[PDB]
Amino acid sequence: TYKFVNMREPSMDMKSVTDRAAQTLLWTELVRGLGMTLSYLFREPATINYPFEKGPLSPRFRGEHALRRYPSGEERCIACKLCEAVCPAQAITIEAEPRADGSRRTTRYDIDMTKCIYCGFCQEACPVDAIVEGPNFEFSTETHEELLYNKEKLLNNGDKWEAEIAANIQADYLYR
Amino acid sequence: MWFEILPGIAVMAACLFIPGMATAHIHKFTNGGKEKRVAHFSYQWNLMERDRRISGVNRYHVTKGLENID
Amino acid sequence: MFMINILSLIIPILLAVAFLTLVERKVLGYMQLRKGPNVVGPYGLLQPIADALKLFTKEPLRPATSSISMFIIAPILALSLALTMWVPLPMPYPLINMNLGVLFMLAMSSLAVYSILWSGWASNSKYALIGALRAVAQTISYEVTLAIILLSVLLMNGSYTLSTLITTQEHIWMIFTSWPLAMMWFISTLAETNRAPFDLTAGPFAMFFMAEYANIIMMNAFTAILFLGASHDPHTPELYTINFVLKTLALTITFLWIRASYPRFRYDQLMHLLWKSFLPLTLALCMWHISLPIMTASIPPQS
Amino acid sequence: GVLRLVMELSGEMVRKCDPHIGLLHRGTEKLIEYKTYLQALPYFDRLDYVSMMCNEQAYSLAVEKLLNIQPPPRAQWIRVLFGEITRLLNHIMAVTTHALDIGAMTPFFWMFEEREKMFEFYERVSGARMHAAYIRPGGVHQDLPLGLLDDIYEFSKNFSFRIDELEEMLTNNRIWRNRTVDIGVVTAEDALNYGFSGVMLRGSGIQWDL
Amino acid sequence: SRGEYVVAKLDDLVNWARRSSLWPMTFGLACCAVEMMHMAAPRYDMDRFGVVFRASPRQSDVMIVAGTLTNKMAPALRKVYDQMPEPRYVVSMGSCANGGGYYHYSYSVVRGCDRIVPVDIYVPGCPPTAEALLYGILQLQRKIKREKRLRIWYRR
Amino acid sequence: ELVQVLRRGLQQVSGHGGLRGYLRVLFRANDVRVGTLVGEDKYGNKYYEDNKQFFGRHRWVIYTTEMNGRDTFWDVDGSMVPPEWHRWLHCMTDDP
Amino acid sequence: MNIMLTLLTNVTLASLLVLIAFWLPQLNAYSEKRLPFSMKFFLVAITFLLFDLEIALLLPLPWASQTNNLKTMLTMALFLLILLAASLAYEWTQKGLEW
Ligand SMILES: CCCCCCCCCCCCCCCCC[C@@H](O)O[C@H](CO[C@H](O)CCCCCCCCCCCCCCC)COP(=O)(O)OCC[N+](C)(C)C
Ligand SMILES: CCCCCCCC/C=C\CCCCCCCC(=O)O[C@H](COC(=O)CCCCCCC/C=C/CCCCCCCC)COP(=O)(O)OCCN
Ligand code: SF4
Numbered sequence A: 001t002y003k004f005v006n007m008r009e010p011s012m013d014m015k016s017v018t019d020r021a022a023q024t025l026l027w028t029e030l031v032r033g034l035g036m037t038l039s040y041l042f043r044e045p046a047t048i049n050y051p052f053e054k055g056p057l058s059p060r061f062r063g064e065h066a067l068r069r070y071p072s073g074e075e076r077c078i079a080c081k082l083c084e085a086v087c088p089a090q091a092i093t094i095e096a097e098p099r100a101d102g103s104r105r106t107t108r109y110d111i112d113m114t115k116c117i118y119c120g121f122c123q124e125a126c127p128v129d130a131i132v133e134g135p136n137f138e139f140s141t142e143t144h145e146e147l148l149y150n151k152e153k154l155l156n157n158g159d160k161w162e163a164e165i166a167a168n169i170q171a172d173y174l175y176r
Numbered sequence B: 001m002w003f004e005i006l007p008g009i010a011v012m013a014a015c016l017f018i019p020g021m022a023t024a025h026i027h028k029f030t031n032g033g034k035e036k037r038v039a040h041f042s043y044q045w046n047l048m049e050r051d052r053r054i055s056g057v058n059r060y061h062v063t064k065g066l067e068n069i070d
Numbered sequence C: 001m002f003m004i005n006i007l008s009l010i011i012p013i014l015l016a017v018a019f020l021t022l023v024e025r026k027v028l029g030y031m032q033l034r035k036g037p038n039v040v041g042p043y044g045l046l047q048p049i050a051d052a053l054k055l056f057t058k059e060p061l062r063p064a065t066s067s068i069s070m071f072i073i074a075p076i077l078a079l080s081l082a083l084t085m086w087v088p089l090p091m092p093y094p095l096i097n098m099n100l101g102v103l104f105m106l107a108m109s110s111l112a113v114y115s116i117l118w119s120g121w122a123s124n125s126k127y128a129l130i131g132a133l134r135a136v137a138q139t140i141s142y143e144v145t146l147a148i149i150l151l152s153v154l155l156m157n158g159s160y161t162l163s164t165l166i167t168t169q170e171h172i173w174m175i176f177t178s179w180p181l182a183m184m185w186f187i188s189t190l191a192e193t194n195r196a197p198f199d200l201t202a203g204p205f206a207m208f209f210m211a212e213y214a215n216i217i218m219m220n221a222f223t224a225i226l227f228l229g230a231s232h233d234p235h236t237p238e239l240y241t242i243n244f245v246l247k248t249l250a251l252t253i254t255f256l257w258i259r260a261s262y263p264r265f266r267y268d269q270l271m272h273l274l275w276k277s278f279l280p281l282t283l284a285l286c287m288w289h290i291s292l293p294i295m296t297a298s299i300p301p302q303s
Numbered sequence D: 001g002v003l004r005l006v007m008e009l010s011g012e013m014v015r016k017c018d019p020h021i022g023l024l025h026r027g028t029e030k031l032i033e034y035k036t037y038l039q040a041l042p043y044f045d046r047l048d049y050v051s052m053m054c055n056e057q058a059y060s061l062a063v064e065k066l067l068n069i070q071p072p073p074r075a076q077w078i079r080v081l082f083g084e085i086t087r088l089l090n091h092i093m094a095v096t097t098h099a100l101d102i103g104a105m106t107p108f109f110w111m112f113e114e115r116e117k118m119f120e121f122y123e124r125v126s127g128a129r130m131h132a133a134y135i136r137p138g139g140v141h142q143d144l145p146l147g148l149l150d151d152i153y154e155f156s157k158n159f160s161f162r163i164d165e166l167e168e169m170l171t172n173n174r175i176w177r178n179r180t181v182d183i184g185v186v187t188a189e190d191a192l193n194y195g196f197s198g199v200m201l202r203g204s205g206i207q208w209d210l
Numbered sequence E: 001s002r003g004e005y006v007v008a009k010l011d012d013l014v015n016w017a018r019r020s021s022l023w024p025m026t027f028g029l030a031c032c033a034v035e036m037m038h039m040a041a042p043r044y045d046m047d048r049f050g051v052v053f054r055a056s057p058r059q060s061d062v063m064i065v066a067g068t069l070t071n072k073m074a075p076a077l078r079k080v081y082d083q084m085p086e087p088r089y090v091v092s093m094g095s096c097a098n099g100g101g102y103y104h105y106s107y108s109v110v111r112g113c114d115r116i117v118p119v120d121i122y123v124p125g126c127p128p129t130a131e132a133l134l135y136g137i138l139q140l141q142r143k144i145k146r147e148k149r150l151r152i153w154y155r156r
Numbered sequence F: 001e002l003v004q005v006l007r008r009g010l011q012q013v014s015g016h017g018g019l020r021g022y023l024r025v026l027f028r029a030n031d032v033r034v035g036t037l038v039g040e041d042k043y044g045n046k047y048y049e050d051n052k053q054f055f056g057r058h059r060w061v062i063y064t065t066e067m068n069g070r071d072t073f074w075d076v077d078g079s080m081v082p083p084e085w086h087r088w089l090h091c092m093t094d095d096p
Numbered sequence G: 001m002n003i004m005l006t007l008l009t010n011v012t013l014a015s016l017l018v019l020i021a022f023w024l025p026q027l028n029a030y031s032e033k034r035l036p037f038s039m040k041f042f043l044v045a046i047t048f049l050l051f052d053l054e055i056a057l058l059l060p061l062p063w064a065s066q067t068n069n070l071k072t073m074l075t076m077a078l079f080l081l082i083l084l085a086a087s088l089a090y091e092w093t094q095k096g097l098e099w
């Protein structure tokens, strides 16, 4: 089924013609648009008082990356390299070797945050929930170099944001 | 809300207040406390000049009333 | 004390045009469901000061090949004319009282286009010159109808003296006597100052902006005096000053409202608007206003 | 976006118009050949970046057709719902930027408030405001959170008045009419021959919709 | 003495003026321009910070590069940068402008806008939310507040 | 009516601890609203809410005047909110 | 004299303020690094000039109304306006107002 948007026929009786002429001469639709804008002036603005007020977010929000660790205090990452295999932008570089106790742990874990596209594929490929994409979005930088994260930076990010990262994972993990 | 526009407008208003009133006050100060005499048409200019000559102080606004008729 | 009067006329107008920029931003913001500047200053009140300081501190981009003479002359002429227009106006008593005040204002408006012409010619660019030519054509075109409308209105005043317009309207505004001419005058003042829907076009740039906004405020003051006659009591002129200023503010906010409300015309569209809708009706209403005082034996006094 | 345009003018009339494009050619199609299908899904978000989930849906439909599988019914309903939301987003953007370029510029803000609300809907479902990467070649990535449908209904029952305000500003305004009426007329045969589709067809009277 | 006090105060005044009215131009090359426009929307309202919307290149204070910079585009970017008055800053928005991002290994993409122009602030994201870009603008304002031009001239 | 909004303005002045606190919040946060205090932060931040405001404006934070090592009377930024209050403030939860 | 002083003050203030605007940013150190001839524009300029001349003819109308020859003055004023309208109509019908 279809509709006509512009298939109207103006009436040609004297009253309609006079209405059209009065609209042309007295600018009725122009005044009506003025009235619309005037009415819109007298209603509350939608502006929020940043940085004292924040825009709403979700537990599913993707932000600055982090490397998590188990409650015992040991890091979750086991160098399976699935996050590096799935990364659409090839932003992750990983190097691993057996630790001093035979544990399978990384020695290099770099994310180029200028290559990242913040798709979250890395956190949904990880089987141990090690790499997450946390809630932080205010991490703008004055140099290009500070956006090339290494393992220490990501581990510090995890230890910094662990409380809210774990709370968000608790809120959202049943949807995965 | 919209009334936060009112402060700035007020300042604008205050500025537009200053010229007009100022002129009026100056016209009162330089014409002996009365309206500045406007002189088109050159007849009332003649009246102003006659007043200036009559006053004796070379000021047209110094009026000489009936007490000067003796 | 005449120098004090000149300064007390000049400085407040510059301050008012400085704060009009702030007011415009605030009004369009609130008409657009947001806020204007409200961070710099208690309610954005220090925004104009910061703007002025930044503009006067920033590097100016001299064309490095242009005629430096006209390049500097154009802002001087624009700002001087914008300030000179305020001399004739009676609020209630004018700084300078002239017999032909209205004709003087018309002459200054007529000169106002040389700034556009010289800036366009001195830019050393074909496209900027073409834009200046279009602007000048629009300006002269609408100033034609300004002159005709203005004399048609003054046919009920008896002279070109601006002060007499206060005496003419002690009992009723001139908006009621001739509203079609008032509508046409308002539109032509839109098109004169290059305001929406007719705006097709560091230091010296701020000079031009100052001159244009002063021209807008003066156009509104002229319109308020010409069509919205305030009551004047000789023993308390500040009442007249307050009424006149309030009406001028309302008309300026009406420009801002119109800017926020509308699309903009094409060049040929506005030229056709003038030459084929405003000029014929302006001529017809000029004939009507020539005839009307004679038919009704209501010819104004002064001759 | 960014466009270069070379035109021959005789007076004010346009005699010849020649657009030069390629200022945003990144080479998406060649880069896709080095990624898997899942890895190549996010490029389609960036292709037409005002209607993201529509591109996602087209890519997913192609991959599903080649895979000989079909998504579950609820996934299809979610896909169509978010496709219509994306259509609302795109039409708001198009109309209000058209008006902005003409010079109206107020409905731009009026309706980008609604656009921000729809971005919040995108964010709640996928964690991303615009490049959701929500619609995959097997269905959708995640299920709706338990309060999403209520908020979608609450948003959608006031939007008609926003469209009405836009129409009040634009539809009957004589300046808008004279800017738009009898401009860029295209005949049905020329529209078909030139490869036009979408509204460009229906504006000329052709009854077609996929 | 008072010589350093006066220059410090005057520098503070000039810094406050310069950072309290930032007039940007935006190369809306790609989809980061959409979030840039959402920062001008009612909710975030960059104008309320003194940051006007779409200033001309001739009177623009900061350049915001929001989108992918291709090889076909870099000369125009540099030319527009060269025609800005001196107190000028560049803000890089999103992955594509920061370091190439999702098109980093492409024959027709410049691997970062900083290969062409010096950049003051990097805003990371794909795209950075309008709030993130606002945070970047305010960070640039704080950076301007930190600078000190009159003291350096005094001591030289 | 209009007297009612004026009395609300005066109550809004008085609820900030006098004219001094009123001007402090006016010149620091560009907003002088009064809401119920939700919590105190170990770095000095204060958290307030007001459910009668529309979504987005119904929660806010007053930043401390001195965080780790710098004077933060004017130089405030959104990275100063700790992760738990970050989650509450950005409306990812209803539980402070 | 008063008007001369007012003009001198206005021009002097404009000159000095433009000069300070143009020299304040030049005290600090920085890097320091056609043919078409549209005929329609000329035609509209000439049309403006001619209508301006006829407006100059119409300008003494406010004083023309006190003459005791009200019929003659009315006839001449309406005649001038008729010729203004006739010029406009002629230029309209000969495609002189097109773009
Ligand atoms: C009268 C003679 C005129 C001559 C030419 C001068 C032009 C007029 C001078 C008047 C300018 C007004 C200055 C007022 C600035 C104060 C603004 C104040 O609010 O700034 C605060 C503090 O800012 C600075 O610390 C103060 C610097 C102000 C100037 C310092 C001394 C200047 C005096 C020099 C005068 C001598 C003039 C000689 C040259 C002709 C905090 O603002 P800020 O942090 O930004 O923004 C953060 C926003 N938050 C709070 C929401 C997060
Ligand atoms: C018994 C004796 C009676 C004597 C006779 C008097 C009777 C008069 C009756 C009729 C007079 C009406 C004339 C009024 C002027 C009409 C001019 C006009 O029609 O122009 C419009 C165009 O006008 C505009 O659109 C201008 C819009 C510009 C934006 C302004 C928005 C309008 C609202 C602003 C408010 C106006 C404020 C005016 C009061 C200000 C007071 C100082 C026509 O354009 P088109 O529709 O395209 O027609 C062309 C093809 N025929
Ligand atoms: S972060 Fe997870 S997916 Fe990546 S290497 Fe470590 S364990 Fe594997």
Ligand code: SF4
Pocket: A083, A086, A087, A088, A089, A090, A091, A092, A111, A115, A116, A117, A118, A119, A120, A121, A122, A123, A133
């Ligand atoms: S979010 Fe996407 S692009 Fe970024 S590191 Fe993870 S997989 Fe790679």
Ligand code: SF4
Pocket: A117, D046, D131, E030, E031, E032, E067, E068, E093, E094, E095, E096, E097, E101, E102, E125, E126, E127, E128
């Ligand atoms: S930086 Fe990211 S969001 Fe912006 S255009 Fe490129 S891919 Fe899209």
